[PDB]
Design an enzyme around this catalytic site. Structure first.
Site, mmCIF file in Angstrom:
data_model
loop_
_atom_site.group_PDB
_atom_site.id
_atom_site.type_symbol
_atom_site.label_atom_id
_atom_site.label_comp_id
_atom_site.label_asym_id
_atom_site.label_seq_id
_atom_site.Cartn_x
_atom_site.Cartn_y
_atom_site.Cartn_z
ATOM 1 N N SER A 202 2.070 -0.862 -10.657
ATOM 2 C CA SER A 202 1.255 -0.436 -9.517
ATOM 3 C C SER A 202 1.542 0.929 -8.932
ATOM 4 O O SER A 202 0.752 1.380 -8.099
ATOM 5 C CB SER A 202 1.302 -1.463 -8.369
ATOM 6 O OG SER A 202 0.364 -2.496 -8.595
ATOM 7 N N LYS B 143 4.483 4.082 -2.653
ATOM 8 C CA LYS B 143 3.637 3.131 -3.383
ATOM 9 C C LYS B 143 4.616 2.407 -4.348
ATOM 10 O O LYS B 143 5.267 3.034 -5.180
ATOM 11 C CB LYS B 143 2.544 3.831 -4.177
ATOM 12 C CG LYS B 143 1.681 2.833 -4.905
ATOM 13 C CD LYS B 143 1.076 1.871 -3.903
ATOM 14 C CE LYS B 143 0.381 0.722 -4.611
ATOM 15 N NZ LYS B 143 0.365 -0.475 -3.744
ATOM 16 N N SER B 144 4.803 1.114 -4.147
ATOM 17 C CA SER B 144 5.732 0.338 -4.976
ATOM 18 C C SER B 144 4.999 -0.278 -6.159
ATOM 19 O O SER B 144 3.753 -0.226 -6.226
ATOM 20 C CB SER B 144 6.324 -0.794 -4.160
ATOM 21 O OG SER B 144 5.263 -1.552 -3.616
ATOM 22 N N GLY B 145 5.765 -0.901 -7.048
ATOM 23 C CA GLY B 145 5.173 -1.533 -8.198
ATOM 24 C C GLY B 145 6.130 -2.549 -8.770
ATOM 25 O O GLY B 145 7.350 -2.472 -8.565
#
EC number: 3.5.2.6
Length: 257
Positions: A39, A201-203
């Site tokens: 992501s 923005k993490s994933g």
């Protein structure tokens, strides 16, 4: 701390790339090893769309139908048979990690082919977008599909957003979404000083405890950000990640600046 030591403590692999855009100073640790980005690429796809659509035209609507829906689309699933603006697509993707919103955004850009063409133009010959959501989450250590290195991803993020061709309005828009999403609170945001503003923005991939966070960090007093890319994974397909690993990594790296 010491990154080698944090690998030992967490029994995990760490990939780090940090660049202070003011001075040009970089901190690199396994910065050329491939990791599934998951992501975190929602940030890249969103930026690429924003380069071709002015802020005032974000009211443009696209039709959503049954065939667009993929797993984990908390927002878009309510738009089956309806129209949604491009602005709300970006908000769904960035704030809620909505997977259909991301795939629709990729389609607006022209497909994976076109995203890949834009990365080459930016000089990123490493980031390898191959599948759409949610298939891109099936990471395999033996496949380069949907992977990048912390150095390449970081440089692409810098050229796209930090020092790119986005208008102010669009740039503020995307950065606000990243500053306000609660999904990254246990990550980079958990390890830097309170003084600092973290737009992230993490994933997380499905396999090998692939847990990531990328951000634009604003030290107290500096207007230019420090691009920080942290990618981690473990040796077994079914390992679960510990978010503390990225929190500690961020604290340690922030000491270099």
């Amino acid at each position: 701390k010491e990154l080698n030591d944090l690998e030992k403590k967490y029994n995990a692999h760490i990939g780090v790339y940090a660049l202070d855009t003011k001075s040009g100073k970089e901190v690199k640790f396994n910065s050329d090893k491939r990791f599934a980005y998951a992501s975190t690429s929602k940030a890249i796809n969103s930026a690429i769309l924003l380069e071709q659509v002015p802020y005032n035209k974000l009211n443009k609507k696209v039709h959503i139908n049954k065939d667009d829906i993929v797993a984990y689309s908390p927002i878009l699933e309510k738009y089956v048979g309806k129209d949604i603006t491009l602005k709300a697509l970006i908000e769904a993707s960035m704030t809620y990690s909505d997977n259909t919103a991301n795939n629709k955004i990729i389609k607006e850009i022209g497909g994976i082919k076109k995203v890949k063409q834009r990365l080459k133009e930016l000089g990123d010959k490493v980031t390898n977008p191959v599948r759409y959501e949610i298939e891109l989450m099936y990471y395999s250590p033996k496949s380069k599909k949907d992977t990048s290195t912390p150095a390449a991803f970081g440089k692409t993020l810098n050229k796209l957003i930090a020092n790119g061709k986005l208008s102010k309005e669009n740039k503020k828009f995307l950065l606000d979404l990243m500053l306000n999403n609660k999904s990254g609170d246990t990550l980079i945001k958990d390890g830097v000083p309170k003084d600092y503003k973290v737009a992230d923005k993490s994933g997380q991939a499905i396999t090998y405890a692939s847990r990531n966070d990328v951000a634009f960090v604003y030290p107290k007093g500096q207007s230019e950000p420090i691009v920080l890319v942290i990618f981690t994974n473990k040796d077994n397909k079914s390992d679960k990640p510990n978010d503390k690993l990225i929190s500690e990594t961020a604290k340690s790296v922030m000491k270099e600046f």
